[PDB]
Amino acid sequence: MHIFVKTLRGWSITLEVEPSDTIENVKAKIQDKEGIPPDQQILIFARKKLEDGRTLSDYNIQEKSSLYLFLRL
Amino acid sequence: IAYERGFRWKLAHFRYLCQSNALPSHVKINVSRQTLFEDSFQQIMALKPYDLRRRLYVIFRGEEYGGLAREWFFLLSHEVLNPMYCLFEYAGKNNYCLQINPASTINPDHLSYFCFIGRFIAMALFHGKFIDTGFSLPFYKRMLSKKLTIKDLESIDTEFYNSLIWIRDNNIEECGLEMYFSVDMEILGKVTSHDLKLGGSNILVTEENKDEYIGLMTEWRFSRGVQEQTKAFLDGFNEVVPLQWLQYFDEKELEVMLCGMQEVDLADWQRNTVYRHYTRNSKQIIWFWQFVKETDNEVRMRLLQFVTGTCRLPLGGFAELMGSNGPQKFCIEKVGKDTWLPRSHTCFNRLDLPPYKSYEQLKEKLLFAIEETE
């Protein structure tokens, strides 16, 4: 299962994930690929902010679903 | 149930403009069935634009009625808008919705092709021939130079829209967001930067540039990577049919003008509609289908455009209705109070129908929403 992580800034990435994966796992993969510490990341999906501890399945995030990433100063 | 917008009046005046500016004699279009795009491109572009207002004379080489002028408009429309050729692309999955491809620059002469497509579409309208374009209502709003709105945005890029809404509703300063008035765009691997404001690396604050930011992102998103293509299209069009002539119409009327009327089958529609927080036994749903029953096809089409973003039905009826996320049947969801007006999300083919208190109230509210909106 793939998910896009997009930014309003305009850059994007693709992530391979598991429906069972938690938001903190996702933010980890983002750190792995992008170098962004998960403490600075904010993920949203369909107008809802995503909390660590919840899985990608608690939101019906599926194949080619697009999350938006916001960065913290 | 009827509602006149003055559409017959508008159509009659637009047709009279075209016919009263018809030119004598003909243009000859000589093509091969297997080289239709290229043959038509070359011949139409070598002609003066006003020649296209002469009567049209099409020849399929090696064969033998306009008539097959109709066949030409049909076959050529489906070919020039085929994503195979990198000029247009499907919007979300497919939806029978087509939009300009930002990566059309892959062909160094793409602007010559968009000029030709503009001419060709204008020719169809001028000659009263219908086309199966998949142009979105926001694309038509652009042809009419009408303001593009944030709801228009939801129809074009749902997640982008959702992200702007989240910004709008939440305190970005408490979250500590770092965002600037600039946006990058990657096309065919090339990144170009665009300041939304002079010197745009310049921070978004809860207020009130976040509202200003949101509106700048909205305006920027509609023409993202397609400004030159869109200008070339509009210029070619305007050469044949002045865009000013279209000002009789709104974007939904324009869509009907171009693509034609369809007969909407009530039974097929009702059988393929799904509900959220309603059932077929909700009195608002019973009223809804009674409404659809009493209403003529022109009001049905305008209701279809409201909820799905087009007057055109897929081959295979409502059972094959597509949404910008894949197959999505017509959906009616209960929201809000009897006070509210109806709303829609065209990307999901979803009508938000408030729990109205009477049949008459539902009829009046719904007619207002589909005839006086978007």
From Swiss-Prot, chain B:
Q: What are the GO cellular component annotations?
A: anchoring junction; cytoplasm; cytosol; extracellular exosome; nucleus; plasma membrane; ubiquitin ligase complex
Q: How is it modified after translation?
A: Auto-ubiquitinated and ubiquitinated by RNF11.
Organ and tissue specificity:
Detected in heart, placenta, pancreas, kidney, liver, skeletal muscle, bone marrow, fetal brain, and at much lower levels in adult brain and lung. Isoform 1 and isoform 5 predominate in all tissues tested, except in testis and bone marrow, where isoform 5 is expressed at much higher levels than isoform 1.
Q: Does the keyword GTP-binding apply?
A: no
Answer whether the UniProt record assigns the keyword Cytoplasm to this protein. Answer: yes
Task: Please list the GO biological process terms of this entry.
Answer: central nervous system development; monoatomic ion transmembrane transport; negative regulation of DNA-templated transcription; proteasome-mediated ubiquitin-dependent protein catabolic process; protein ubiquitination; signal transduction; symbiont entry into host cell
Spell out the residues of the site Required for ubiquitin-thioester formation: 347
Q: Which GO terms describe its molecular function?
A: ubiquitin protein ligase activity; ubiquitin-protein transferase activity
UniProt keyword list: Cell junction, Cell membrane, Cytoplasm, Host-virus interaction, Membrane, Nucleus, Repeat, Transferase, Ubl conjugation, Ubl conjugation pathway
| Free-text comment about domains | The WW domains mediate interaction with PPxY motif-containing proteins.
Q: Could you describe the subunit structure of this protein? A: Interacts with the Crumbs complex components PALS1 and PATJ; interaction with the Crumbs complex is enhanced by WWP1's interaction with AMOTL2 and facilitates WWP1 localization to the plasma membrane. Interaction with the Crumbs complex promotes WWP1 monoubiquitination of AMOTL2, which activates the Hippo signaling pathway. Binds KLF2 and HIVEP3. Binds SCNN1A, SCNN1B, SCNN1G, WBP1, WBP2, DRPLA and adenovirus type 2 PIII. Interacts with RNF11. Interacts with SPART. Interacts with ERBB4 isoforms JM-B CYT-1 and JM-A CYT-1.
Q: What does this protein do?
A: E3 ubiquitin-protein ligase which accepts ubiquitin from an E2 ubiquitin-conjugating enzyme in the form of a thioester and then directly transfers the ubiquitin to targeted substrates. Ubiquitinates ERBB4 isoforms JM-A CYT-1 and JM-B CYT-1, KLF2, KLF5 and TP63 and promotes their proteasomal degradation. Ubiquitinates RNF11 without targeting it for degradation. Ubiquitinates and promotes degradation of TGFBR1; the ubiquitination is enhanced by SMAD7. Ubiquitinates SMAD6 and SMAD7.
Its protein name is NEDD4-like E3 ubiquitin-protein ligase WWP1
Native species: Homo sapiens (Human)
Q: Which residues of the full protein are shown?
A: 541 to 917 of 922
